[PDB]
Each structure stands twice: as structure tokens, then as C-alpha cells.
């Protein structure tokens, strides 16, 4: 039994990949992810120009997860485009390229240049509408009119299939509205749920201090804290976007957690915090653990249980 | 060394109380909370008429916290009003009464009747604008115009100091807007951050099933899952509402967790999931643990460290 699957006109060895931002900023990182057992990889969310990001310390991990306010430190779109066009070995695994411009104009500028490379190489766009860490720039997809504008403009400028990295929602009306916006756009083929849970605050009791420097300690949460939130979002969008794929991200540390994401509706399963903490060896463990659970239950394929979470 | 507080023209032996909805639905529950070592208690969020609530199972707890879709089961406003008027022993500790009408009109109706009892007995109103569990009724305070309408109408009909139970926010723009709305209302004297993190989904791997029945398994999250979110909201409103009090709620299992809430700016500290799981004995443990931390640090009173969380220069 193997975990191999086909999606978006690509073949994947297994459903696992890094979450955008983790182990994917430099050529070294991307080569490392390519050499790993992951089924795919995605590059760091990029901007038109290189960015240093927010002041350090800006990432901290704990038993229950992580907090981060990286601030989109990246080598610039030129680099990630070059990686996609010239450097990536597509015979190894598919590549997603994540973009996170600070305005609709910036995103449009990037996708116009990405298009010919997508046409030639098959690199897949993930449009990030959910960065919670750039000062003065609220999560785009928490403003539904802004979200619609970004998707309209990117659809028109790109003209090719793409996906969207979504923020977590906490309100049924918001699930309804967000999914309806997404469903207006036929080029949106996948929806990644979720980005970090925005603007949490970790405080150290001994020092009586916040643990990260940017934004007075406020940063996005990942890891064990966010699994039920992530599952809810995966399932909410799986139910509301029956003609799109949903990729799960949030709180994956084990094959069992991945199994839950897939039950909720996930096609691909992304790994952030756990990968940052454990390193790329995690992918062989996750694959082994998922296959074991499948064998115990008598499942031979992912399709047998994807989206099949039972209600009472 | 002491945990005493004096706020809202009441005296509290310590900052601890139940979170609304936990151990506070029946007369038995309220007497139990009164008999505990808590500094105060709050009654179950009530509606004009009694409610059975959502179908069971509707609460489940786990090592990292809880999920619930109770659906506002309650004995009705008449009962909680009678409790505040006739039954509560105010000599023991202060009482808060939580209301969660399903419309602005329902809340207005209740506060009109609560006002003379608040005036006579000193019961304190907590207006719940953040229930995430009634089908078809989104969290009021996620709609800022609705929030303003509720606060305007309740302020005018009630005319007395009250507080607001707020949902968690995750966006700096939302902290800014929500606090600005609250600051328009001088009768809002306290802000309780936070209600449960809405519409999470817990799935059991073995049975491949959601663990609660209502709303296809979607329910509010509490407990360890939500502590950093709760601290963020407490501190965000503490910073933005310098002329109000902030009450902390979310993820408190220990004196250390309470200490963090207080550093973030909390006056009172409410306990939900951990109280549901451990029972009212938790209050003596939290008091002992908080006093131990204070002793180790040389803090003599809560005011010496409330809101004093340090940021990195
Ligand atoms: C160090 C750090 C950097 C991240 N950078 C990005 C980013 O560039 N783009 C993005 O869409 N998400 C980014 N994320 C969010 C993750 O992709 C993921 O959505 C989130 O961490 C939740 O998954 P987890 O619980 O596995 O950590 C970052 C997360 C962390 C921990
Ligand atoms: C069983 C259950 C019932 C609740 N009922 C109410 C309610 O009636 N009114 C309210 O404002 N919050 C209610 N809550 C939310 C809690 O007051 C609290 O805000 C939340 O559980 C987070 O705190 P915790 O992490 O200590 O559980 C309820 C929570 C649970 C666990
Ligand atoms: O989309 C993003 C951006 C990233 C960062 O701060 O660079 N951090 C995140 O958690 N999500
Ligand atoms: O405000 C509320 C209401 C309660 C319920 O469902 O009755 N559950 C909650 O988590 N918060």
C-alpha cells in the first residue's frame, strides 16, 4: 500500500508538504525540502522586493505550539521565480509558489510574471490572503470586499489555475460568506485552511515578558493550540466548496492528526510548526503513521475516507 | 500578601470566579459557587424564557481543553432575577448576572426589569455579546454595527454600570474597532475577554466521528487551546480601554495562568473548562498557587503587577 495521489494535473507520492514559510526561504531550504520524503513543497510567501522582516526574536516554540511574527522575510519574488523556472527538479515532486504582496497591485505584478513559468514548468500558485504579521496590514480575507477585489484582479492578470491560503474563521456567517466569495472564481482550484491563528500573545511567567519582539508580542499561533480550529475550517470549506480542493494546514504532528485532516476533507496536508521543530525527517514518520492507521482500519486509499467524517 | 480587590463599588476576597455557564445554571449550582472559596460568581447566560438548549452530547473535555455547543440552556430570566433579588447571600460574595437575549429587544426587556434589583441589591450585569452556539445567530460582537446598537439600547434602557462578555478577535483592526465602540459607552465599566473560540471541530480518530451533536460537531473551544488568544485579547483591551476594567477568561488551570492574565491586565480572573473538569475545589488551589508566585517575586498586592507585562525593546 502506498499514499500516491493525483491532483491539479500533477502526481504526488503522498499528501504531505511543508506549510508555506517553514523550511522554504533559501535555495538551501528548498533543496532540502526537495530531498525530503514530502509529496510536494511550497516556497516562502514572497514580495516584489526582498524583505528583512520584523525584528528578532520573532519565532518561539513551546510544548503546545508556536508563536511567530516573521513579517514576510524573503529573498524577493525574482529569486523564487528563478527557483521555479531554472532550479527546481520537477521529476522529484511538484512545486507551489506562495505570494503575499502588500497590495493588490503588488500581487498582480507578480502573477503576470509567474504566468509564463506556470505555463512552461507547471509550478502552482498559492495566493496568501492571510498574513497576520505585517504592521498596519490586516489579513486580507477578513475584509470580504478586499478579498473579492484581490481574487478578481489576480484571476484576470494570471488566467491560470491557482489556490488561496485562507485565515481561520470562527463564525458560521463568515464561513458562508468566505466560501461564497471563493465560489465566484473558477480559477481558484484549491483552498488552504488555515494560516496561523492571528495575534495571539505568549507571556513568560518568570521574566514577566512577552516572548517575541514585534508588535508588542502579538503573533500568529500554530501547532497543538490550533488543531480543532484548523479541522473546522477544512471541513467548513470542504462542505461549502464541493467543486474545489481543500488543503489542510494546522496542528499536524502525527499520522493521526493528518488522518483527521483528511477525514475533514483535506487533499494535501501541510506541516508547519511540527516541521520547524522536528526537521524534514518528520515526513517519513508521518507517512509511516498514516499508513499504519489506514491498515488498522482496512482503508486502501485516501479517497475511501476523505471528507467522510461522521456527524451525530 | 493579599488577593483582595475593591472595584465596581464592591469588595472581593480574591480575583477568582466561575466563567459564565459553568456551575451556575440551577439554584444548587449557585449555592455551590457561593459556598466555594471564589471571590465572586456569575449566573448562566439567560434568555427571557427557559431554554432546553441544543441536543446532547453537547460538551466534551480533553487533555487540551473543551468543546461545547450548549445552546443557552437556562432556567429563564425570571429565575435568575429571583435568585439575585431573594436568594443570593451578598454577605458571602458579589454576584454577576449574565444575559444573552437572542435579539436587542430581548436584552432590553430583561435589563428594564433587572435595573431596580441592581439598584437595590448591587447585582452586576454582564451582557453576553459572544455566544457562538445558537444556530442561525452569529456572535453579536463580530458585527460592529450590531454591537453598537445593542450597547446603545441596553445603556438607555438599563442606565446603570454594566460589563460586556466579548468574543476573541484575531486581527489588530478588530481590536481597534471593538475597543473604540466600547469606549463610546461610559456605562460599560468592565470588559470580559474572552468567550469560547467559536466553531472549532473536534474529531475522534477511532470512531471517525465528531464528538458533539449540534451543528455537525462545530462548537466553542475553551481550555489550554485558547490561553495565548485569551491573553492577547485581555491585553489588547487593557491597552485600548484605559478607563475601563478588563476581566480575564480563557485557559486558566493554575495560579501561573492567572498570574499571566493579571500581568496582561486582568482584574477578575474567570475559570471555565478547568472548573467544569476539576470542580469548585479548584479555587483554593488557584489562590494558593497565585500567592506562591507572588511570594517568590516579592509582590504584596495584585496592583503591583496588574498590566505590567514587559515588551521587548
Ligand atoms: C515560522 C513561520 C513562518 C510562516 N510563514 C508563512 C508564510 O510565508 N506564508 C504562509 O502562508 N504561511 C506562513 N506560515 C503559517 C503556516 O504556513 C501555517 O499556516 C501555520 O503555521 C499553521 O500550521 P501549523 O499548526 O502546522 O504550524 C508561517 C508559520 C510559521 C511558524
Ligand atoms: C459548558 C460551557 C458553557 C458555557 N456557557 C456560557 C454562557 O452561558 N455565557 C458565557 O458568556 N460564556 C459561556 N461559556 C464560555 C465560558 O464562559 C468561557 O468564556 C470559555 O469557556 C473560555 O474559558 P475557559 O478556557 O476557562 O473554558 C461556557 C463555556 C462552557 C465550557
Ligand atoms: O502568512 C504568514 C506570514 C508569516 C510571516 O510573518 O512571514 N507568518 C504567518 O504565520 N503567516
Ligand atoms: O456564550 C456562550 C454560550 C454557551 C452556550 O452554548 O450556552 N457556550 C459558550 O461557549 N458561550
UniProtKB/Swiss-Prot annotation, chain A:
Protein name, UniProt field: Dihydroorotate dehydrogenase (fumarate)
pH dependence as annotated: Optimum pH is 7.
Temperature dependence: Optimum temperature is 37 degrees Celsius.
Cofactor(s) required for function per UniProt: FMN
One GO term of the biological process aspect: 'de novo' UMP biosynthetic process
GO CC terms of this entry: cytoplasm
Organism listed in the record: Trypanosoma cruzi (strain CL Brener)
Pathway: Pyrimidine metabolism; UMP biosynthesis via de novo pathway
Quaternary organization: Homodimer.
Subcellular location: Cytoplasm
UniProt binding sites for substrate: 44, 68-72, 128, 133, 195-196
Effect upon mutating residue 284 to R: In allele DHOD3
One Pfam family in the UniProt entry: DHO_dh
